[PDB]
Amino acid sequence: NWEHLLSLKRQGDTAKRLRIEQDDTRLGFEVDYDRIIFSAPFRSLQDKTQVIPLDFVHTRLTHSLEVSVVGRSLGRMVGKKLLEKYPHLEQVYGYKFNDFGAIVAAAALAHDIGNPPFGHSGEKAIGEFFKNGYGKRYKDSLTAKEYQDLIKFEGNANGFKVLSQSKPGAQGGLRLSYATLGAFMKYPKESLPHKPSDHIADKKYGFFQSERALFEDVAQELGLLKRSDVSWSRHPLAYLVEAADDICYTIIDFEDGINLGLIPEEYALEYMVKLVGQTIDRNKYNALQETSDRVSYLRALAIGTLINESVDTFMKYEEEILAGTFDQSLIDKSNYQAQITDIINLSIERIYNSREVIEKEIAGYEILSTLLEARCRALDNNDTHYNQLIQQLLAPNEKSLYENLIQICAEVSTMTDGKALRNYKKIKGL
Amino acid sequence: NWEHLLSLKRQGDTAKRLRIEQDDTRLGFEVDYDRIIFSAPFRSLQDKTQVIPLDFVHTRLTHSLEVSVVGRSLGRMVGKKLLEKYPHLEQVYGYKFNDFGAIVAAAALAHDIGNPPFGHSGEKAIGEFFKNGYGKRYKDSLTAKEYQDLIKFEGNANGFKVLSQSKPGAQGGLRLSYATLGAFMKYPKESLPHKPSDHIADKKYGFFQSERALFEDVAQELGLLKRSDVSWSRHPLAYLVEAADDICYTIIDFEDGINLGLIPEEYALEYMVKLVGQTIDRNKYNALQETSDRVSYLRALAIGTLINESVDTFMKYEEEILAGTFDQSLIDKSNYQAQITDIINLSIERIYNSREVIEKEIAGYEILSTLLEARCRALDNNDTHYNQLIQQLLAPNEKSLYENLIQICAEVSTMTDGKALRNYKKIKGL
Amino acid sequence: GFFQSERALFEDVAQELGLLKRSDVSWSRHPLAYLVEAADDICYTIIDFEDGINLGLIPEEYALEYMVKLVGQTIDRNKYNALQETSDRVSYLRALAIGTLINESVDTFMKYEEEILAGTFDQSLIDKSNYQAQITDIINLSIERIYNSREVIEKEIAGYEILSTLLEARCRALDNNDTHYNQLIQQLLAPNEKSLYENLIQICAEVSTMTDGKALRNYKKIKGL
Ligand SMILES: Nc1ncnc2c1ncn2[C@H]1C[C@H](O)[C@@H](COP(=O)(O)OP(=O)(O)OP(=O)(O)O)O1
Ligand SMILES: Nc1ncnc2c1ncn2[C@H]1C[C@H](O)[C@@H](COP(=O)(O)OP(=O)(O)OP(=O)(O)O)O1
Ligand SMILES: Nc1ncnc2c1ncn2[C@H]1C[C@H](O)[C@@H](COP(=O)(O)OP(=O)(O)OP(=O)(O)O)O1
Ligand SMILES: Nc1ncnc2c1ncn2[C@H]1C[C@H](O)[C@@H](COP(=O)(O)OP(=O)(O)OP(=O)(O)O)O1
Ligand SMILES: Nc1ncnc2c1ncn2[C@H]1C[C@H](O)[C@@H](COP(=O)(O)OP(=O)(O)OP(=O)(O)O)O1
Ligand SMILES: [Mg+2]
Ligand SMILES: [Mg+2]
Ligand SMILES: [Mg+2]
C-alpha cells in the first residue's frame, strides 16, 4: 500500500504526523534535504575520491549533486504517473507529485555519505585488516555475525549509521523521515548468510548489528514484506535512486575519462550514437569547436533519454516491483545495454587501470593499514604513555568490544584524503 | 506588474512561452537550476576561497548551496503571500508559490560564480594592475567607461558575462530564463558615474560594456523602471537573494570562526541570545557536550528567525520596493541589528586580520600581478618565440583591444587557487 | 659556423684543406660534412619518432602506417607478428628504416659526387631521396604532438627565465667590478685582461657549459630556494 510507504514520522515521535495537517511551505521531506545540506559529514564529502584520488574531475559532492537532480526528475515523473493511476491518494490523504521527487532527491543526496576515503580501495583495506592483519587477533572474541561485518566492511551500513547515530543531547542523529530512510536502504538484510541467492538485493548487507532495532522499527512502520535472520523487500524509490546513480556514474565517468587524456573522441562519438539518435541537431553539433562542448552536449542528451527510458521501465513493472518479485535493476532491463556494457568495459580497461590510480590505491592501502593497527594497539592496553598519546591525538573525544571496533572503523572512514595523508605524514615525523 | 517580472522567454526565442502551456514536471526555472548544476564554472567553485584561502571550513560551493536553500525558503514564503494577496495570478496565468522559490534558488546558486580566486584580494589585485602596474600603458587607447571597468573589476559583471557568454555553436551560453537573470542582477547600472548617490543599488556596477545590449533587452522585457547612461530598478527577488546571502555569510562565517580556534564560545553564547531567545530548549542545549553541536544548534535557530523576520520585512514594504523608492536592504531594516553589527565587527577584528589570511592575500596579490603582466606582454607583440610559448601555454584556445583585455581578465578569473599556484610555480621553474 | 675570435684558425684550416673560395670569407662544404649531416638527420627523425611512440603521445597505428615503404622489402611478417610488446616491434621497424635510409643515402651521395666535389650541390642528401612524403609526415606529426606538449612548453619557459637571469647577473657582475655583491657573484659564477667582445663571448660560453640540473640548482640557490 502506497499510503504506508510514504511515512512522515521520525524517531522518538508519538503522534500520527498526518500529511493533511502540514504546511506546504516547508514539507517534511524538504527538511531532510535542508538537514543533510548543513550536515558535517556531507560537507566532508568535498575532499573524497570518485575515481582519481587526490581539477575539473568530479568528486563525491558533485556526483551526489548530479544524482540528487536526476533522481529527483525520475521520482517526480514516477509520482505524477502513480497519482494519475491512483486517484484516492490525492483525494483523501492529499499527496502531490513533488513529494516523490523530494523523497528521491533526499535519498540520492546522502547515498554516498559513509564511504571510506580513497574510494574503492579503502573498504578493501579495512576488510583485509581484520583478515590478513592484526585484527585477526579479535576473531575469537566476537560472534560470527559481528566478525562478518568487520571483515566485509560496507559503505551503505556506515552511511546508515552516520545518518542514525545517537549522541548525548541529540537522539536520532539527523532525525530523517522514515520514507527517506527506506528509500536510502538498498540491501535490507543482515550480513549473514553471505549471498544466499542471485537476487539484486542480497549481494551485500545494509546495516550493522548495532542498528538492527532501528531498521526493524523503520521496516515495521513502512510495511516492507518479510522474506526470511531478518530480511525485507526493496522500496521502489530505492530502485529509482539506484537507477539514477547508475546513469550518473556511467555517463559522468565516461565523459571524465574522455577529457583527461585517456580516451579518444572517436570512442565518444561511436559508442554514443543510439542514445543520442533521435534527439540531436547535426548543425549545432558541427558548429561547436572544442571537444568539451560536444561531449557535454552528448552527455546531456544521453542523460535525458536514459531518464525517460528508466521511467518507462519502472512503470512497466510496477506490480512486480511492489509485490517484491522483481529480481533485477531498471538499467539492465533497458533496450540500450550493449553500448552501456562497452562504455563500462572501456572505463575498466583504461580509466581504472591507470598507473596513477594503482599507485594512489596502494598508498591508501598502506595508510589505512597503519592507521587501523595504531588505533587497535592504542585501544587494546590503555596503560602506556605512547598509547595515551595516540588516544589523545587520534580520538580526543564505556562500551563493548564490538562497538569499540565499529566506532574505530567509523572514525577512520570519517577522515578525508588530505587529512589522512597529513596525519600519516606527521605521525611518521615527515 | 508581476505578470511581466516572471518572464519565461530565453535568448534567441520568437514565440511567447506562456506559463499555462508548459508541463509541470520540469518547469523552465528548474531547467535553469539543472543547467547551472552541470556547468563547468559551477564545478570550478569547489576550489575557490570563501574567507581562509587554501578542511571543515566552507568554500564557495557550500556557501552557494546554503544560500540556494535559504533564498528558496524566503522566495517560497514570499510567493505564497503574494498569491494570497493577488488572486488573478493563479486564476488567469496559472502561477504557483514554487515558481518564486525556484527562481530565487536558481539566482542564489550562481550569485558568486564569476568571482576571481583568492577571494577579496583578487579583484583588488586585478584593479590595481591597470592603475599602478603595466596596465596603465593601455589607458590612452581606451575610452573612459572601458577603462573604468578594468580599473574597477567586479565579480557581478564577470558572473553575468560567464552566464551570458556566446560561443560558436552555443549562442547565449547557458540560456537562462529572463526572470532568473533579472533576479541575479544586483546593480542594474553601468560603471559611470561612480557612486552618484547613497542608494543601495548604485554602489557598484553589474555589467560590462560588451554586454550592454543583452541587459537592455532583458530589462525591456522584464519591465524594470528607468531611472536615468542607462540605469534601472532592482528586482524584488534580487532583494530576497541579497537578504538570503547576507544572513548566510554573517552566520556561517561567525560559526566557522568559532570552531577554528579564533573565537571563544563565550562570545557565541553572549552575542546570540535575542536571535535564539523564544525558540530554544534549555534542556536540549545543556544536554549537548561538544561545542560544535551547540554552535550548530544556535546557527540553526538564528537562521530560522532571521528568515522569518526578513520575510516579514519584505512584506511590510512591498509597494515601496515595487515602486523603486526603497533605498535600503532588508537586513538593515530589521529589529536585530546591534548583534549583527557586533558579530561583523568581531569577525573583521579577529578573522579577517589573521596572519595566515594576510600572507595568503599577499601571495595571491603577487601571483595575479605576474600572471596579468605575462598575459599582457604576450598579447602586445605576438612576434617573439617566448610570447608564442606563453600564448600556447596560458591561452591555447580577431577582436578589439577592449575585448581582448576583458577576455584576459575573465580567463585569469577562471583559474582556481590550486591551479593558479601550480601555474605560478611551474612558470618559475619551481 | 664560427665567431670572429676564431676566424684565423678556420682560415688556416680551409687553406690547408683546399676548400673552394666562394666570396666576407666563405668556403664550400666538405663531402664528409654532407655525410655527417645525413647521418644526424636520419637519427633524430627516426629516434624522435620512436621515442614519441613509447612515451604515450603517439599510437602504434601511426607507427605501422607511416613506416611501410621504408620497411617494405626488408621485413619478415612471421617474426613481426610473433612479437608481443610494442617496444620490440618499434625497435624492429626502427632497425629496418635506419638500414634502408643508410643505403639510400650512400647511393644518393655516390650519384652526385662530381657536383658535390665541385661545390655546385645546393641541397642535402635526405631531401634528394625517394622517401620524402613519409619523412615529412613523421616530422609534422612530431611537431604537432611532441614539440607542443604542455610539459615541453613549461620547461622551455623555465629555461628561458633561468638563462635570462643568469645572463643579466653575469653582465651586471662584469660591468662594474667594484661593489661587494659583484665580487661575490664573480667568485661564485666564474672563479677561474681581454676586450669587451671576448668578455661577452666567454660569458656566453660559460653559461652554455652548465647542464640542466646544475643550472637549476644554481638558479634555486642564488634565490635562496
Ligand atoms: N530530463 C532531465 N532531467 C534532469 N536532468 C536532465 C534531463 N535531461 C538532461 N539532464 C541533464 C543533462 C543536461 O545536460 C542538463 C540540462 O538539461 P537540458 O538543458 O534540459 O538538456 P539539453 O542540453 O539537451 O537541452 P534541450 O532541451 O535544448 O535539448 O541536465
Ligand atoms: N574497480 C574499480 N576501481 C576503481 N573505481 C571503481 C571501480 N569500480 C567502480 N569504481 C568507481 C566508478 C564510480 O565512479 C564509483 C562509484 O561506484 P560505487 O557506488 O562504488 O559502485 P556500486 O554501484 O557497485 O556500489 P554499491 O553496490 O556498493 O552501492 O566507483
Ligand atoms: N526555515 C528554514 N528554512 C531553511 N533553512 C532553515 C530554516 N531554519 C533553519 N534552517 C537551516 C539551519 C538549520 O540548522 C537547518 C535545518 O533546519 P531545521 O532542522 O528545520 O531546524 P532546527 O534544527 O532548529 O529544528 P527544529 O524545528 O527542531 O527546531 O537549516
Ligand atoms: N575585508 C574582507 N577580507 C576578507 N574577507 C572578507 C572581507 N569582507 C568580506 N569578506 C568575506 C566574508 C564573506 O564570507 C565573503 C563573501 O562576501 P562578499 O559577497 O564578497 O561581500 P559583499 O556582500 O560586500 O559583496 P557584493 O556587494 O560585491 O556582492 O567575503
Ligand atoms: N647498416 C647499418 N649500419 C649501422 N647501423 C645500422 C645498420 N642497420 C641498422 N642499424 C642500426 C639499427 C639496428 O636496429 C641496429 C643493429 O643493426 P642490425 O642488427 O644489423 O639490424 P637488424 O635488426 O635489421 O638485423 P638483420 O640483419 O637480422 O635484419 O643498428
Ligand atoms: Mg553514487
Ligand atoms: Mg554569497
Ligand atoms: Mg645531432
Nearest protein CA to atom 24 of ligand 2, as residue:
A246
CA distance C151 to chain B (A): 9
Kindly list the protein residues that place their beta carbon closer than 5 angstroms to ligand 6, a single-atom ion.
A 112, 245
CA distance C138 to chain B (A): 22
Please answer yes or no on whether B168 and A25 come within 8 Å at the CB atom: no
Q: How many CB pairs under 8 A join B and C?
A: 29
Please answer yes or no on whether C225 and B430 come within 8 Å at the CB atom: yes
Please answer yes or no on whether B390 and C157 come within 8 Å at the CB atom: yes
By C-alpha distance, the chain C residue nearest B395 is C150
Q: Map grid coordinates 534567441 to a residue.
A: B12
Q: Is B303 in the pocket of ligand 3 (CB under 6 A)?
A: yes
Please answer yes or no on whether C148 and B427 come within 8 Å at the CB atom: no
CA angle B397, B403, B407 (to 5 degrees): 45
DSSP state letter for A406? H
Q: How far is CA B319 from the centre of its chain?
A: 26
By C-alpha distance, the chain B residue nearest A79 is B25
Q: Please give the Cα distance from B79 to B90 (Å, whole number).
A: 11
Q: Please give the Cα distance from C73 to C133 (Å, whole number).
A: 18
Q: Which chains sit next to B, with 3 or more Cβ pairs under 8 A?
A: A, C
Q: Structure solved using which method?
A: cryo-EM
Please answer yes or no on whether B429 and C150 come within 8 Å at the CB atom: no
Residues of B in contact with C154 (CB under 8 A): 393, 426-427
SS (H, E, C) A205-227: CCCCHHHHHHHHHHHHHHCCCCC
Please tell me whether residue A49 adopts helix, strand or coil conformation: coil
Q: Please give the Cα distance from C143 to C132 (Å, whole number).
A: 16
Please answer yes or no on whether B389 and C159 come within 8 Å at the CB atom: no
Residue burial B315-326, b: 16+ Cβ < 10 Å; e: rest: eebeeebeeeeb
Q: Please give the Cα distance from B135 to B368 (Å, whole number).
A: 13
Return the best residue to mutate from C98, C104, C106 for the ligand 5 pocket (most ligand atoms within 8 A of CB). C98
CA distance B429 to chain C (A): 5
Q: Are A263 and A292 in contact (CB under 8 A)?
A: no
Residues of A in contact with B422 (CB under 8 A): none
Cell of A44: 566532508
Q: Is B51 in the pocket of ligand 4 (CB under 6 A)?
A: yes
Q: Which chains sit next to A, with 3 or more Cβ pairs under 8 A?
A: B
Q: Which chains sit next to C, with 3 or more Cβ pairs under 8 A?
A: B
Q: Please give the Cα distance from B17 to B34 (Å, whole number).
A: 19
Q: Please give the Cα distance from A193 to A191 (Å, whole number).
A: 6
Nearest protein CA to atom 8 of ligand 4, as residue:
B120
What residues have CB less than 8 Å from B145, skipping those under 6 apart?
B190, B191, B192, B209
Q: Please give the Cα distance from A53 to A318 (Å, whole number).
A: 39
Q: How far is CA B128 from the centre of its chain?
A: 22
Residue burial A250-280, b: 16+ Cβ < 10 Å; e: rest: bbbbbbbbbbeeebeeebbeebbeebbeeee
By C-alpha distance, the chain B residue nearest A287 is B169
Helix axes A355-380, A120-129, angle to 10 degrees: 40
Q: Are B364 and B122 in contact (CB under 8 A)?
A: yes
Return the closest-CA partner of residue A108 out of A63, A45, A175. Answer: A63
Distance from residue B201's CA to the centre of ligand 4 (Å) = 16
Return the closest-CA partner of residue A119 out of A63, A160, A68, A173. Answer: A63
CA–CA distances in Å: residue C50 to residues A262, C19, C53, C55, C64: 20, 38, 5, 9, 11
DSSP state letter for A191? S
A126-131 long-range contacts (CB < 8 A, ≥24 apart) are A126/A153, A126/A368, A126/A372, A126/A409, A126/A412, A126/A413, A127/A151, A127/A152, A127/A153, A129/A368, A129/A369, A129/A372, A129/A373
Cell of B126: 586585478
Distance from residue B96's CA to the centre of ligand 7 (Å) = 27
Q: Is B60 one of the annotated binding-site residues? A: yes
Sign of CA dihedral A135, A140, A142, A148: positive
Please tell me whether residue A415 adopts helix, strand or coil conformation: coil
Peptide bond into B188 cis (omega under 30): no
Q: Is C88 one of the annotated binding-site residues? A: no
Instruction: Write out residues with Cβ below 6 Å of ligand 2.
Output: A 50-51, 119-120, 249, 253, 352
By C-alpha distance, the chain B residue nearest A396 is B290
CA distance A182 to chain B (A): 24
Q: Tally Cβ neighbours within 10 Å of residue B167.
A: 13
Q: Are A45 and A112 in contact (CB under 8 A)?
A: yes
Sign of CA dihedral A98, A100, A102, A108: negative
Q: Is B213 left (phi over 0), alpha (psi -120 to 50) or beta?
A: alpha
Return the closest-CA partner of residue A295 out of A343, A333, A332. Answer: A343
What residues have CB less than 8 Å from A44, skipping those under 6 apart?
A414, A416, B56
Q: Are B215 and B11 in contact (CB under 8 A)?
A: no
Q: Is A317 one of the annotated binding-site residues? A: no
CA distance B90 to chain A (A): 16
By C-alpha distance, the chain B residue nearest A77 is B25
Q: Please give the Cα distance from B310 to B331 (Å, whole number).
A: 7
CA angle A239, A309, A262 (to 5 degrees): 90
DSSP state letter for B189? B
Cell of A214: 532501528
Residue burial A291-320, b: 16+ Cβ < 10 Å; e: rest: eebbbbbbbebbbebbbebbbebbeebeee
Please tell me whether residue B5 adopts helix, strand or coil conformation: helix
Instruction: Collect all residues from B whose CB is shorter than 8 A from any CB in C.
Output: 386, 389-390, 392-393, 426-430
Cell of B405: 583585455
Q: Please give the Cα distance from B248 to B299 (Å, whole number).
A: 10
Residues of C in contact with B430 (CB under 8 A): 220, 225
Q: How far is CA A47 from the centre of its chain?
A: 16
Most distant CA pair in chain A, distance: 74
Please answer yes or no on whether B289 and A168 come within 8 Å at the CB atom: yes
What residues have CB less than 8 Å from A197, skipping those under 6 apart?
none
What residues have CB less than 8 Å from A357, skipping those under 6 apart?
A51, A52, A53, A351
Q: Map grid coordinates 548487507 to a residue.
A: A205
The residue length of chain C stands at 225
Q: Please give the Cα distance from A265 to A255 (Å, whole number).
A: 10
Return the closest-CA partner of residue B271 out of B289, B245, B253. Answer: B253
Instruction: Write out residues with Cβ below 6 Å of ligand 5.
Output: C 95-96, 98-99, 102
Q: Please give the Cα distance from B302 to B278 (Å, whole number).
A: 11
Please answer yes or no on whether A59 and B46 come within 8 Å at the CB atom: yes
Return the closest-CA partner of residue A427 out of A371, A381, A379, A376. Answer: A371
Q: What are phi and psi of A231, to 5 degrees?
A: -155, 145
By C-alpha distance, the chain B residue nearest C221 is B430
CA distance A87 to chain B (A): 18
DSSP state letter for B12? T
Please answer yes or no on whether B46 and A43 come within 8 Å at the CB atom: no
Return the closest-CA partner of residue B270 out of B246, B254, B249. Answer: B254
Q: Please give the Cα distance from C2 to C10 (Å, whole number).
A: 8
CA–CA distances in Å: residue A133 to residues A380, A405, A420: 15, 14, 20
Q: How far is CA B122 from the centre of its chain?
A: 15
Q: Are A101 and A73 in contact (CB under 8 A)?
A: yes
Nearest protein CA to atom 21 of ligand 5, as residue:
C95
Please answer yes or no on whether B389 and C158 come within 8 Å at the CB atom: no
